[PDB]
Design an enzyme around this catalytic site. Structure first.
Site, mmCIF file in Angstrom:
data_model
loop_
_atom_site.group_PDB
_atom_site.id
_atom_site.type_symbol
_atom_site.label_atom_id
_atom_site.label_comp_id
_atom_site.label_asym_id
_atom_site.label_seq_id
_atom_site.Cartn_x
_atom_site.Cartn_y
_atom_site.Cartn_z
ATOM 1 N N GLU A 1 11.925 5.838 -38.187
ATOM 2 C CA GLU A 1 10.735 5.167 -38.689
ATOM 3 C C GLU A 1 10.748 3.746 -38.180
ATOM 4 O OE1 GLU A 1 10.798 5.384 -42.901
ATOM 5 O OE2 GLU A 1 10.450 7.566 -42.944
ATOM 6 N N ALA B 1 19.679 -1.776 -31.586
ATOM 7 C CA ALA B 1 19.202 -3.049 -31.042
ATOM 8 C C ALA B 1 20.161 -3.482 -29.934
ATOM 9 C CB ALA B 1 19.081 -4.143 -32.133
ATOM 10 N N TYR C 1 12.296 5.233 -27.609
ATOM 11 C CA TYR C 1 12.541 6.506 -28.257
ATOM 12 C C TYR C 1 11.786 7.614 -27.574
ATOM 13 C CZ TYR C 1 14.376 8.961 -32.348
ATOM 14 O OH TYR C 1 15.060 9.779 -33.205
HETATM 15 C C1 LIG Z 1 14.564 -0.535 -28.028
HETATM 16 C C2 LIG Z 1 15.781 -1.220 -27.379
HETATM 17 C C3 LIG Z 1 17.045 -0.951 -28.267
HETATM 18 C C4 LIG Z 1 16.018 -0.607 -26.007
HETATM 19 O O1 LIG Z 1 17.291 -1.085 -25.623
HETATM 20 P P1 LIG Z 1 17.704 -1.109 -24.063
HETATM 21 O O2 LIG Z 1 19.190 -1.221 -23.895
HETATM 22 O O3 LIG Z 1 16.820 -2.074 -23.316
HETATM 23 O O4 LIG Z 1 17.248 0.401 -23.666
HETATM 24 P P2 LIG Z 1 17.582 1.253 -22.326
HETATM 25 O O5 LIG Z 1 17.771 0.313 -21.147
HETATM 26 O O6 LIG Z 1 18.708 2.211 -22.662
HETATM 27 O O7 LIG Z 1 16.175 2.092 -22.269
HETATM 28 C C5 LIG Z 1 15.969 3.116 -21.661
HETATM 29 C C6 LIG Z 1 14.628 3.442 -21.186
HETATM 30 O O8 LIG Z 1 13.659 3.063 -22.367
HETATM 31 C C7 LIG Z 1 12.384 2.592 -21.882
HETATM 32 N N1 LIG Z 1 11.911 1.283 -22.392
HETATM 33 C C8 LIG Z 1 13.005 0.700 -22.938
HETATM 34 N N2 LIG Z 1 12.656 -0.529 -23.388
HETATM 35 C C9 LIG Z 1 11.338 -0.652 -23.089
HETATM 36 C C10 LIG Z 1 10.435 -1.665 -23.282
HETATM 37 N N3 LIG Z 1 10.715 -2.912 -23.945
HETATM 38 N N4 LIG Z 1 9.173 -1.528 -22.864
HETATM 39 C C11 LIG Z 1 8.760 -0.396 -22.232
HETATM 40 N N5 LIG Z 1 9.634 0.608 -22.024
HETATM 41 C C12 LIG Z 1 10.914 0.447 -22.472
HETATM 42 C C13 LIG Z 1 12.623 2.488 -20.413
HETATM 43 O O9 LIG Z 1 11.767 3.543 -19.761
HETATM 44 C C14 LIG Z 1 14.126 2.472 -20.340
HETATM 45 O O10 LIG Z 1 14.404 3.162 -19.107
HETATM 46 P P3 LIG Z 1 14.671 2.248 -17.804
HETATM 47 O O11 LIG Z 1 15.627 1.199 -18.100
HETATM 48 O O12 LIG Z 1 15.260 3.377 -16.823
HETATM 49 O O13 LIG Z 1 13.391 1.490 -17.388
HETATM 50 C C15 LIG Z 1 15.545 -2.734 -27.238
HETATM 51 O O14 LIG Z 1 14.211 -2.948 -26.771
HETATM 52 C C16 LIG Z 1 15.663 -3.425 -28.589
HETATM 53 O O15 LIG Z 1 16.707 -3.856 -29.034
HETATM 54 N N6 LIG Z 1 14.416 -3.570 -29.226
HETATM 55 C C17 LIG Z 1 14.326 -4.247 -30.549
HETATM 56 C C18 LIG Z 1 15.151 -3.379 -31.484
HETATM 57 C C19 LIG Z 1 14.442 -2.912 -32.724
HETATM 58 O O16 LIG Z 1 13.343 -3.281 -32.932
HETATM 59 N N7 LIG Z 1 15.148 -2.111 -33.681
HETATM 60 C C20 LIG Z 1 14.522 -1.673 -34.946
HETATM 61 C C21 LIG Z 1 13.771 -0.363 -34.769
HETATM 62 S S1 LIG Z 1 14.955 0.931 -34.266
#
Ligand SMILES: CC(C)(COP(=O)(O)OP(=O)(O)OC[C@H]1O[C@@H](n2cnc3c(N)ncnc32)[C@H](O)[C@@H]1OP(=O)(O)O)[C@@H](O)C(=O)NCCC(=O)NCCS
Length: 147
Positions: free
Chosen positions: A104, A71, A116
């Site tokens: 998951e 996260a 992912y």
């Molecule tokens: C998933 C999460 C960790 C991604 O974190 P982040 O630091 O924004 O991720 P990154 O910047 O490293 O992502 C890399 C690539 O993922 C893709 N992507 C990431 N977040 C996305 C989003 N919300 N929507 C669409 N594509 C996304 C992009 O293609 C991104 O590449 P880019 O920045 O070059 O556009 C963040 O959305 C999060 O914290 N989500 C809620 C966490 C969660 O639900 N955890 C429980 C299940 S594991």
């Protein structure tokens, strides 16, 4: 501009739980993050702007690895934070004889799914009605990432 990545420690749990509250649908309680302080659970945190902005937690089990949670605080999203955290986690897993990372995630958790997938994850199954939902239950999508 400084950035620090390190293994997490018990003192981190309040901020980690705050990141969860801010970022994760149906977030883990503060007590759930103490629960994976125990053996075979490994975590890392990123510090940016003098505070924690993201964390990742894996489980080393059998010969392979499971992503328990990842996260990033919303103000720090879409800057590569989770990408860096996952790279660090996978370097640890690969050194400990793992090659496949299981995730998951709730079917509705679009951001975690798209993250992912862009890291190489592939859907391998569905567990129907696996999570509690506001009404009824919610499917879990099951992904594998090779590394
Ligand atoms: C998933 C999460 C960790 C991604 O974190 P982040 O630091 O924004 O991720 P990154 O910047 O490293 O992502 C890399 C690539 O993922 C893709 N992507 C990431 N977040 C996305 C989003 N919300 N929507 C669409 N594509 C996304 C992009 O293609 C991104 O590449 P880019 O920045 O070059 O556009 C963040 O959305 C999060 O914290 N989500 C809620 C966490 C969660 O639900 N955890 C429980 C299940 S594991």
């Amino acid at each position: 501009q400084s950035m620090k990545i390190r293994n997490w420690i018990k003192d981190d749990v309040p901020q980690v739980s705050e990141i969860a509250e801010a970022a994760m649908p149906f977030p883990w309680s503060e007590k759930f993050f103490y629960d994976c302080l125990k053996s075979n659970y490994y975590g890392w945190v990123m510090e940016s702007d003098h505070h924690l902005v993201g964390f990742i937690v894996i489980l080393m089990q059998e010969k392979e690895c499971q992503l328990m949670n990842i996260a990033v605080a919303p103000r720090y999203q879409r800057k590569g934070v989770a990408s860096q955290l996952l790279q660090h986690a996978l370097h640890y897993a690969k050194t400990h004889h793992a090659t496949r990372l299981l995730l998951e995630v709730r079917k509705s958790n679009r951001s975690a799914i798209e993250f992912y997938k862009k890291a190489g994850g592939v859907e391998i199954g569905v567990r129907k009605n696996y999570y509690p939902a506001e009404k009824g239950r919610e499917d879990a999508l099951v992904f594998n990432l090779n590394f």
